[PDB]
Each structure stands twice: as structure tokens, then as C-alpha cells.
């Protein structure tokens, strides 16, 4: 999950040098931040949406 | 340049447990679903015998 700042039109991302044996491809989509609860969390006090 | 130079010169961490009390548990649970039926059974039996006044007064 990579953050796209409000009103930003470009989102550059990278992964440093790696082995790609058995890689299958990429799937991607866009999400709202308020509509996405943090996973590394027992509870997320900023997830102010249901 | 000199005198003092001899020595040297965030957002959200998201805790959860805060300042409340301790908690405990036990496993002797749940008769209570029966009374919800006791109550609504005996409620009918009230009306049933109100009817038994009326059905004898009407004779």
C-alpha cells in the first residue's frame, strides 16, 4: 500500500534489486485512505468510517 | 569556533490499553434464555384466564 498525497497526479515506486524466479505479474487498484483500516493494529483510532 | 565546542551539542504511535481497571472471567453461564420464554408463556396464561372470566360471565 503506497500513499498518494492529496492532489498528487504521479506516484513513483520502486523495489531494490531482487530475484524474480516464479514471479507471476502485477495486480493494482486505488483506495481511499479513510476507507482503509491499518492492518498492523489491534485497534485503529483514526479509522473513523464504517 | 571555540570555548563551547569542547563538549558536543512525529504522527501516530497508537497505543490502546490506557488508564482503566483490571478484568476477570468465569464459565457458569446462561440459564437466562429460558425466562424469556417463561415470561411470555405466563403472560399468555394471564390473558387465557381473563378469557375464562368472560366466557363464564357470557353464560
Q: What is the 3-state secondary structure (H, E, C) of B1-59?
A: CCCCCCCCCCCCCCCCCCCCCCCCCCCCCCCCHHHHHHHHHHHHHHHHHHHHHHHHHCC
> DSSP class of residue A17?
S
Of the candidates A41, A26, A22, the residue with the CA atom closest to the CA atom of residue A13: A26
Cell of A12: 513513483
Interchain contact B56–A (C-beta under 8 A) = no
Interface test with B, best of A33, A39, A40, A45 (most B CBs within 10 A): A45
Q: Which sign does the torsion angle of CA B33, B36, B39, B41 carry?
A: negative
| Cβ A35 vs Cβ A49: under 8 Å | yes
B16 to chain A, any CB pair closer than 8 A? The answer is: yes
Let me know: does B47 contact B40? Beta carbons within 8 Å: no
Structural contact between residues A36 and B10, judged by C-beta atoms closer than 8 angstroms: no
Handedness of CA B36, B42, B44, B50 (dihedral sign): negative
CB contact under 8 A, B16 and A44: no
What angle is formed at CA A36 by the lines to CA A35 and CA A37, rounded to 5 degrees? 125
Measured from the Cβ of residue B14, the count of other Cβ atoms closer than 10 Å reads 13
- Resolution in angstroms comes to 3.3
Amino acid at each position: 500500500l503506497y500513499p498518494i498525497p492529496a492532489k498528487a497526479t504521479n506516484v513513483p515506486i520502486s523495489i531494490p534489486s531482487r530475484n524474480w524466479a516464479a514471479f507471476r505479474g502485477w495486480s493494482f487498484t486505488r483506495l481511499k485512505t479513510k476507507e482503509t483500516p491499518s492492518l498492523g493494529s489491534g485497534f485503529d483510532p483514526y479509522f473513523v468510517y464504517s | 569556533a571555540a570555548a563551547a565546542m569542547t563538549a558536543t551539542r512525529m504522527p501516530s504511535s497508537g497505543s490502546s490499553p490506557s488508564v482503566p481497571s483490571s478484568i476477570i472471567a468465569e464459565e457458569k453461564l446462561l440459564a437466562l434464555l429460558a425466562e424469556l420464554e417463561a415470561l411470555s408463556r405466563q403472560l399468555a396464561a394471564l390473558t387465557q384466564q381473563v378469557s375464562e372470566l368472560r366466557e363464564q360471565q357470557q353464560q
